[PDB]
PDB file of C-alpha atoms in Angstrom:
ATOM      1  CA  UNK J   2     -11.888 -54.891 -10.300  1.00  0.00           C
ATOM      2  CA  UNK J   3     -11.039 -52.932  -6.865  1.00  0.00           C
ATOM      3  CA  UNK J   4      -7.013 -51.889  -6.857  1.00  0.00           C
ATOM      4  CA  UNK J   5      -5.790 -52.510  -3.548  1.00  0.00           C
ATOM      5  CA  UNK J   6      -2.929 -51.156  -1.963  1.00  0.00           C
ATOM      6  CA  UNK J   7      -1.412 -51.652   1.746  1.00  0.00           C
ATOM      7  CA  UNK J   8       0.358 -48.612   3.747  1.00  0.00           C
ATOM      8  CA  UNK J   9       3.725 -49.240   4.234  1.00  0.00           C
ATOM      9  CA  UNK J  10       4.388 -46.198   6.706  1.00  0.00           C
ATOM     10  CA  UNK J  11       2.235 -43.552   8.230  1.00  0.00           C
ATOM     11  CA  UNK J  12       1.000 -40.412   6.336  1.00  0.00           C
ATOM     12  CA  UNK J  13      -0.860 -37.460   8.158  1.00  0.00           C
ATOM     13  CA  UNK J  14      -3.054 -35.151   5.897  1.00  0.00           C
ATOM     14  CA  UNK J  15      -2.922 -31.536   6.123  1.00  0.00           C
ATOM     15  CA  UNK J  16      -5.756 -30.786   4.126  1.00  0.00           C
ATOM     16  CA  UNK J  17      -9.532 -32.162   4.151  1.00  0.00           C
ATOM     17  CA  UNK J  18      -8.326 -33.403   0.389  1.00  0.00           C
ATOM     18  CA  UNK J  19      -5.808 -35.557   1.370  1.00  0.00           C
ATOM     19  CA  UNK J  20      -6.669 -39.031   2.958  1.00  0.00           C
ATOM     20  CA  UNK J  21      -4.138 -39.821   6.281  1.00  0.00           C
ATOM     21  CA  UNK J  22      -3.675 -43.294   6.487  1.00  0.00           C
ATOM     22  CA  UNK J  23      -1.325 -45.534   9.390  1.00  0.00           C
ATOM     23  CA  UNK J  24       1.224 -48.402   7.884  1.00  0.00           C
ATOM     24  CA  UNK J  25      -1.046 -51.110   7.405  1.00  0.00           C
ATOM     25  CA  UNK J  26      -3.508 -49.722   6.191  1.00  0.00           C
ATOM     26  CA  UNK J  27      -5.885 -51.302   2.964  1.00  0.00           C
ATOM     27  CA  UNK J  28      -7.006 -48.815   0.508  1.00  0.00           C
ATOM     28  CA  UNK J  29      -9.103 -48.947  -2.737  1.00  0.00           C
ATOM     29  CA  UNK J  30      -7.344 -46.472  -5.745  1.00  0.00           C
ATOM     30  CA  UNK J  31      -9.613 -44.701  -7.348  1.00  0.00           C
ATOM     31  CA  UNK J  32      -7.537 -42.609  -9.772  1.00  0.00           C
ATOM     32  CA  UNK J  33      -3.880 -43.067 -10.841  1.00  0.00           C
ATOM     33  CA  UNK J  34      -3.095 -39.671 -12.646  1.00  0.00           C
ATOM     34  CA  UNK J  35       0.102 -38.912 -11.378  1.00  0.00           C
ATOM     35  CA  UNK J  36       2.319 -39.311  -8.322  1.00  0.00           C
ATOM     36  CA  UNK J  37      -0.792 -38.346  -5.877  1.00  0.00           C
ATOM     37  CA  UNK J  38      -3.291 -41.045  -6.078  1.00  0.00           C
ATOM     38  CA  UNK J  39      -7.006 -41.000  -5.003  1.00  0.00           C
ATOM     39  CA  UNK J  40      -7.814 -43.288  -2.650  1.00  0.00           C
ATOM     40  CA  UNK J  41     -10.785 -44.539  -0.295  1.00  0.00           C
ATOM     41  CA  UNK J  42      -9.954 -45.928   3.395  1.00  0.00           C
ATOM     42  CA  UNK J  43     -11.384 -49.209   3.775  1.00  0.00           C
ATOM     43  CA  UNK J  44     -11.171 -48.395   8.007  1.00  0.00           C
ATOM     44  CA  UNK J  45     -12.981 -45.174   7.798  1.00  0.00           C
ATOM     45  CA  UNK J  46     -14.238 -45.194   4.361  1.00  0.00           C
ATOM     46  CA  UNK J  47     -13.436 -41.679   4.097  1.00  0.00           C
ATOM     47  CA  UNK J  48     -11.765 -40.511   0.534  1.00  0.00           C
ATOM     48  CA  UNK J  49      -8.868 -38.217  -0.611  1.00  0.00           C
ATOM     49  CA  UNK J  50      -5.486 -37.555  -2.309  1.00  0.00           C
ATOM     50  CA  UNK J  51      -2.268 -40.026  -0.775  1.00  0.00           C
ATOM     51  CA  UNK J  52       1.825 -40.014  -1.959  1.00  0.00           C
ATOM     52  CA  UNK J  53       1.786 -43.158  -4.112  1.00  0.00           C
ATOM     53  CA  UNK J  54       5.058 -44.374  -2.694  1.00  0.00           C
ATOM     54  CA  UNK J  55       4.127 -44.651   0.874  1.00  0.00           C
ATOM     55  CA  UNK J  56       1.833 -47.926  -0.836  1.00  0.00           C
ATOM     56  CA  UNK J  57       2.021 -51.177  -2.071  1.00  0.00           C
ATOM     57  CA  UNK J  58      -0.044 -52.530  -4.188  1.00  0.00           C
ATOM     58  CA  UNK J  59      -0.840 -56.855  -3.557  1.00  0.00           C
ATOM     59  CA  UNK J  60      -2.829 -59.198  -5.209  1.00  0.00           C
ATOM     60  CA  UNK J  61      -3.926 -61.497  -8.530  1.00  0.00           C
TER      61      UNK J  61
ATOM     62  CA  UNK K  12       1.760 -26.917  26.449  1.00  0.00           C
ATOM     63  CA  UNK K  13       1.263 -27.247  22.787  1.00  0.00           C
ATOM     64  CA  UNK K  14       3.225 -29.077  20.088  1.00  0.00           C
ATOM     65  CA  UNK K  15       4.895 -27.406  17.950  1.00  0.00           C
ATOM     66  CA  UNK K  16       5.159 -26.829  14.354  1.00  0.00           C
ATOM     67  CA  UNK K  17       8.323 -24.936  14.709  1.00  0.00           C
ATOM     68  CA  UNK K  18      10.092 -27.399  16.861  1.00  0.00           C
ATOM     69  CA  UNK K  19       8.750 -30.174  14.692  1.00  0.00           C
ATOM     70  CA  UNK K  20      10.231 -28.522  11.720  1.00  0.00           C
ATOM     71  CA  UNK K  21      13.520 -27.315  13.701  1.00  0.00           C
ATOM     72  CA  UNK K  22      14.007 -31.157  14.825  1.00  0.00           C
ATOM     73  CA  UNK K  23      14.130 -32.285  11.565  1.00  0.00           C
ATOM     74  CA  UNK K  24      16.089 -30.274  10.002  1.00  0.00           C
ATOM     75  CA  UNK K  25      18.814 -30.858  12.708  1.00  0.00           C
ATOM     76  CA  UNK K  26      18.487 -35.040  12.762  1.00  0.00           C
ATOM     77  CA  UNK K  27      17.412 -34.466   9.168  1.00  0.00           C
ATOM     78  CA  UNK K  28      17.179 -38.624   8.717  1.00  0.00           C
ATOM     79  CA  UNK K  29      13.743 -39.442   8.105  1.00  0.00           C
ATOM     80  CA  UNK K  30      12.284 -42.980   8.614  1.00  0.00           C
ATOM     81  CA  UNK K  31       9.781 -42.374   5.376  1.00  0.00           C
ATOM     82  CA  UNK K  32      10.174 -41.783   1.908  1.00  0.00           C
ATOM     83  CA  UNK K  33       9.961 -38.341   0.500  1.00  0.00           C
ATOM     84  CA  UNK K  34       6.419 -37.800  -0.886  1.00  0.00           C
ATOM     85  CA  UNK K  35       5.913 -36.744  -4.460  1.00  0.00           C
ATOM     86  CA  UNK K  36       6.085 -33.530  -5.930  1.00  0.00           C
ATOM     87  CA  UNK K  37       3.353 -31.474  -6.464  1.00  0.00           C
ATOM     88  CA  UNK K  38       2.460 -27.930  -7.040  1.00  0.00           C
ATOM     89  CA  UNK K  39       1.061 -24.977  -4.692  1.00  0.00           C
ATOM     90  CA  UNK K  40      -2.362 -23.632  -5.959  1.00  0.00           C
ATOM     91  CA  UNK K  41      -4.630 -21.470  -3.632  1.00  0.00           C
ATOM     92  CA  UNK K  42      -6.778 -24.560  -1.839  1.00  0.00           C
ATOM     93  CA  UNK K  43      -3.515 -25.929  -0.558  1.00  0.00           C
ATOM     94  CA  UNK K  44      -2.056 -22.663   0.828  1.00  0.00           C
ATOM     95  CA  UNK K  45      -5.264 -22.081   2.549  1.00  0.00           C
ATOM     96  CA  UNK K  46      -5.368 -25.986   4.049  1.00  0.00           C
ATOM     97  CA  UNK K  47      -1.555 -25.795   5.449  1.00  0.00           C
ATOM     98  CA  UNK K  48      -2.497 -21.920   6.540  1.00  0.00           C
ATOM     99  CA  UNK K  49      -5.406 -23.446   8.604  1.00  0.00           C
ATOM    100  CA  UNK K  50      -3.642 -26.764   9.451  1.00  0.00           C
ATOM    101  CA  UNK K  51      -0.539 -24.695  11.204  1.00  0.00           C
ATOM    102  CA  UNK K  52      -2.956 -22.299  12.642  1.00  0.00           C
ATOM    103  CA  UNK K  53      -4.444 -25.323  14.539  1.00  0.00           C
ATOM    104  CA  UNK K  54      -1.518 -26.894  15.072  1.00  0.00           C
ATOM    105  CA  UNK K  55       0.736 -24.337  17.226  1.00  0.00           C
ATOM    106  CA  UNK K  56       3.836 -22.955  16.999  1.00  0.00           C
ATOM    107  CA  UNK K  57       3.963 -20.888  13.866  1.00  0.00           C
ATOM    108  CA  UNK K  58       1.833 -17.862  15.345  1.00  0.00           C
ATOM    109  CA  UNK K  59       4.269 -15.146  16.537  1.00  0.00           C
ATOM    110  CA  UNK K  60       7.467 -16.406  15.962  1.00  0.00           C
ATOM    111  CA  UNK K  61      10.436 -14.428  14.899  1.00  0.00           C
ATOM    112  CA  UNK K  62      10.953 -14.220  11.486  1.00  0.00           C
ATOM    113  CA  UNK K  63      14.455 -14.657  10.101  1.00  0.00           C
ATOM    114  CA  UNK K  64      15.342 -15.903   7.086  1.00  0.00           C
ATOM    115  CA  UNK K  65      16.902 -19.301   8.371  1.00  0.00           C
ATOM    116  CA  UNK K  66      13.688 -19.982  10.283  1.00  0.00           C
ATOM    117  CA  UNK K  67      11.508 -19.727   6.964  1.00  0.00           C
ATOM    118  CA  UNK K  68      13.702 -22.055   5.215  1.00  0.00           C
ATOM    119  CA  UNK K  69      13.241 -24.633   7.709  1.00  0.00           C
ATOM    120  CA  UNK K  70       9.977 -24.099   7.596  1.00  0.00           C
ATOM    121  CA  UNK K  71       9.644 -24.188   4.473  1.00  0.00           C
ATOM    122  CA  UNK K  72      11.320 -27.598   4.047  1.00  0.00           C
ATOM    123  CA  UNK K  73       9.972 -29.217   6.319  1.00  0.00           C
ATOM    124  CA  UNK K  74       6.771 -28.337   4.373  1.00  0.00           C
ATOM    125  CA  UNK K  75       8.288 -29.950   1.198  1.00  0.00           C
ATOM    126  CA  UNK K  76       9.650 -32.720   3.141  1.00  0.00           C
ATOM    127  CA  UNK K  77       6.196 -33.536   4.897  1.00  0.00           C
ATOM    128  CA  UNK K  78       3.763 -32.648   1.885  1.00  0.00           C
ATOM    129  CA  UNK K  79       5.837 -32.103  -1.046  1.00  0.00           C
ATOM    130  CA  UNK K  80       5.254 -28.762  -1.896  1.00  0.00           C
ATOM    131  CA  UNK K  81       8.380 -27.232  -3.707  1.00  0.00           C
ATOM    132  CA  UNK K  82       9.981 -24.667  -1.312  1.00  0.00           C
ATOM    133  CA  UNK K  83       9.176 -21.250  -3.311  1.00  0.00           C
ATOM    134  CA  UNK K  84       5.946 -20.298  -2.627  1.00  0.00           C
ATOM    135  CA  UNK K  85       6.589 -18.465   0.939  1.00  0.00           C
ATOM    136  CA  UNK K  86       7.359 -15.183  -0.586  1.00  0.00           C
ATOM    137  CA  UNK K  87       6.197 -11.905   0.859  1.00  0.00           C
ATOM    138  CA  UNK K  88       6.559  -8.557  -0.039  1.00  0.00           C
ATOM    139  CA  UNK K  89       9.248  -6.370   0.601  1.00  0.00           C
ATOM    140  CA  UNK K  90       9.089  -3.712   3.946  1.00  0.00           C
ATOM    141  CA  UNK K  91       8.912  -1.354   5.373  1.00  0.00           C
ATOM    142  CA  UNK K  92       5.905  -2.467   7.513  1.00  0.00           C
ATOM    143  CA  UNK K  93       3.574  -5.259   7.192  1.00  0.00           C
ATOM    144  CA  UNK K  94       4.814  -8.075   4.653  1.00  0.00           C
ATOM    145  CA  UNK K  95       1.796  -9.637   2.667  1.00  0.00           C
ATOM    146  CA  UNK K  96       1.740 -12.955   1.000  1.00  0.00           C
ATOM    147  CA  UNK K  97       2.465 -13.660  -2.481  1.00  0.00           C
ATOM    148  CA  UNK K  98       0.853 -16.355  -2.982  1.00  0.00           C
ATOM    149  CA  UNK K  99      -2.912 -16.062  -2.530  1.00  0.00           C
ATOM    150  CA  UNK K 100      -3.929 -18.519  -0.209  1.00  0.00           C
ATOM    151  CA  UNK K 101      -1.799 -18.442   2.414  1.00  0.00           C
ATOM    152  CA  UNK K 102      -3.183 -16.555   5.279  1.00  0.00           C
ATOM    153  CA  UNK K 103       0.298 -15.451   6.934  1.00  0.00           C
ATOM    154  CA  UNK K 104       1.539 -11.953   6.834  1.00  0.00           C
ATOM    155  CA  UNK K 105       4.902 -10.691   8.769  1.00  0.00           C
ATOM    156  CA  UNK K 106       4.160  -8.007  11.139  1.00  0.00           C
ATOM    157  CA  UNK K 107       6.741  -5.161  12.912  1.00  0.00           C
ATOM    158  CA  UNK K 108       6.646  -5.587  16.354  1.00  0.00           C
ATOM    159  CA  UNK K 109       8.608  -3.075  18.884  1.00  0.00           C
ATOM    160  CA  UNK K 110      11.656  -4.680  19.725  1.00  0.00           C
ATOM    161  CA  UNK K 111      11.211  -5.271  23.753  1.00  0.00           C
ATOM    162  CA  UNK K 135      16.385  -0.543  19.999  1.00  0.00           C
ATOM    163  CA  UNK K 136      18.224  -1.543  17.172  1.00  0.00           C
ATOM    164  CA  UNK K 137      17.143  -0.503  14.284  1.00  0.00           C
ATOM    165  CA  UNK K 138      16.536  -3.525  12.061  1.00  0.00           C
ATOM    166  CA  UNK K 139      12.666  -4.297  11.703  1.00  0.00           C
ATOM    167  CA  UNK K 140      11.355  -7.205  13.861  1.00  0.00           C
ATOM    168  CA  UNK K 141       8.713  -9.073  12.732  1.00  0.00           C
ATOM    169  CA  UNK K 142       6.756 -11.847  13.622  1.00  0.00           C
ATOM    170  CA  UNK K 143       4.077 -14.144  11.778  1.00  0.00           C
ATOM    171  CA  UNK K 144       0.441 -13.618  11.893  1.00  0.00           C
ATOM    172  CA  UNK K 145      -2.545 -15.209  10.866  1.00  0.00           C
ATOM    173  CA  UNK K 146      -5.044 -13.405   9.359  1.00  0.00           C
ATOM    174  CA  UNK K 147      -8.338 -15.314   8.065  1.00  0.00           C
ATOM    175  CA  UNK K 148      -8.767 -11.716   5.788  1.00  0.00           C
ATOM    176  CA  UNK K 149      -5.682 -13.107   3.546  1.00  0.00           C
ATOM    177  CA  UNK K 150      -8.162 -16.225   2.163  1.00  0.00           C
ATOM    178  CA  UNK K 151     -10.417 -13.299   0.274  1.00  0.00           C
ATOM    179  CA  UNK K 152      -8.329 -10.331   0.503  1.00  0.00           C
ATOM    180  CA  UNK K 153      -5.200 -10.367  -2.111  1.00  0.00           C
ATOM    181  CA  UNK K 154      -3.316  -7.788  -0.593  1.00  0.00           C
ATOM    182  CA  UNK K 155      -0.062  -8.206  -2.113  1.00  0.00           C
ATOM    183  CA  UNK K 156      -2.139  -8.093  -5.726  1.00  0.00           C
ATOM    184  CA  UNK K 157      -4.392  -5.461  -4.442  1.00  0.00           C
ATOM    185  CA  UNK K 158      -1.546  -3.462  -2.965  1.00  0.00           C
ATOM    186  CA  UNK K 159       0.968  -3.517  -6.078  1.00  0.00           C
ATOM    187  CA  UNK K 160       0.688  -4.832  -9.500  1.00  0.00           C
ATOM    188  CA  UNK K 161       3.652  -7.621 -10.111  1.00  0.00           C
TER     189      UNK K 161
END
């Protein structure tokens, strides 16, 4: 099942790769390689790279 | 007026306390030179500043604070006259201007959209 993780501070993209995201934020991980972890916006639903330890992941 | 990615940089470096962890490591490859290139471009302040070497270092940190891009990939090469990129990807060159006298070179920054196809530093040398 979906890996959730809540912002917990702001992070503005520079690149069309990586996803910007505002503390508070709920995003789905998609891939967990290393220290840059893809992600999908649940807000926007748009996709891209984000620093792992701006996140938090909750639940189960 | 615009807002600046030289006073953004400039400000942090002088408070240099920020309220966000440092983001992860990761290393400079061609797609990412050409993003920041573009994303600076947009953003202001960058486009015909002085160079000096204390100016690209805080630029250049505030790059690896913000994005985490290890500070070694600004390199261009050596005068006299225009100063090309190392690393392909990055679409900033250093230009002479005249010095509106001295005689050290002046240059400034420049974006040039000919630097995302054009290696010049490879296609000029052979390092």
């Amino acid at each position: 099942e979906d890996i959730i993780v809540v912002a917990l501070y702001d992070y503005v993209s520079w690149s069309p790769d990586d996803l910007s995201f505002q503390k508070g934020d709920q995003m789905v991980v998609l891939e967990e390689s290393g220290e840059w972890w893809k992600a999908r916006s649940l807000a926007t639903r748009k996709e891209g790279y984000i620093p792992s330890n701006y996140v938090a992941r909750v639940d189960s | 007026n615009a807002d600046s990615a030289w006073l953004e940089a400039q400000e942090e470096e002088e408070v240099g306390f920020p309220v966000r962890p440092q983001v992860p490591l990761r290393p400079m490859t061609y797609k990412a030179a050409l993003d920041i290139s573009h994303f600076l471009k947009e953003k202001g302040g960058l486009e015909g500043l002085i160079w000096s070497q204390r100016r690209q270092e805080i630029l250049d940190l505030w790059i690896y604070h913000t994005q985490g891009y290890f500070p070694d990939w600004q390199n261009y090469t050596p005068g006299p006259g225009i100063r090309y990129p190392l690393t392909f990807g990055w679409c900033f060159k250093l230009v002479p201007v005249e010095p509106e006298d001295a005689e050290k070179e002046v240059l400034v920054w420049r974006f040039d959209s000919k630097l995302a196809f054009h290696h010049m530093a490879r296609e000029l040398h052979p390092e």
